[PDB]
Structure 1
Amino acid sequence: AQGHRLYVKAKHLSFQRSKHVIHPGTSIVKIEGCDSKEEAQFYLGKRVCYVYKSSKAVRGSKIRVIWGTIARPHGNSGAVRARFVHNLPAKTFGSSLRVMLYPSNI
């Protein structure tokens, strides 16, 4: 049963925003477990995916993935900023993400 999951779960909190302006260019990711700004230095540079589904059966799979990279730490509590190839849609606020362990540094 537990012979999978070589990634780390996360959540797409929101866009890196001012008070009244959202900058959809870069999102905010909270990795499940990160708890400091020094902690996020490990997760910087990793690859993060947002796995969603749709009715179209492209290449025999309803499942689609939007790629992304952890870019820099955000704040003092351990959230990071991510730059995805396609800006994550505004409807995934709170949805689940996977920060896979590669590219590694150890």
Structure 2
Amino acid sequence: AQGHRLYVKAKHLSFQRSKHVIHPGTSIVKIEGCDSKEEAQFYLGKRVCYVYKSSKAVRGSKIRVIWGTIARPHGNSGAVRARFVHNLPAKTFGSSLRVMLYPSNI
């Protein structure tokens, strides 16, 4: 079954925020194996998505997706900032995201 997964696993950590004020427009994402801002530069501009499952069949699909793009690195520990077409729900803190390898430049 290990002939798939053209994406890199990532986790939605939190919104971009100060101590008390949150900014849900842009999110903080931890990409696995990305441990520095120098490594985050490779993942800049990649296409990240949140995949979740619903009971209602939209166009005959149980799976629906919210797309987004990695915008910039965040901090020193490899976390990145991500902008989505729909702001990610606050219930996804700790949920997983798929970071594709496109738009590719490697």
Distance of 1:103 and 1:32 partners within structure 2? 19
Superimposed CA distance per residue, residues 5-54 of structure 1 (whole angstroms, 9 cap, x where no aligned partner):
00000000000100000000100110011011111000000000100011
* Matched residue count: 106
SS in 1 for 2:14: strand
CA RMSD of the aligned region, Å? 0.5
Identity of aligned residues (%): 100
SS in 1 for 2:94: coil
SS in 1 for 2:42: helix
Provide the TM-score with structure 1 as the length reference: 0.98
Which ranges in structure 2 are unaligned for 5 or more consecutive residues? none
Runs of at least 4 residues of structure 1 off by over 4 A? none
Distance of 1:97 and 1:44 partners within structure 2? 15
Provide the TM-score with structure 2 as the length reference: 0.98
Distance of 2:32 and 2:19 partners within structure 1? 25
Alpha-carbon offset, residue 60 of structure 1: 1.4
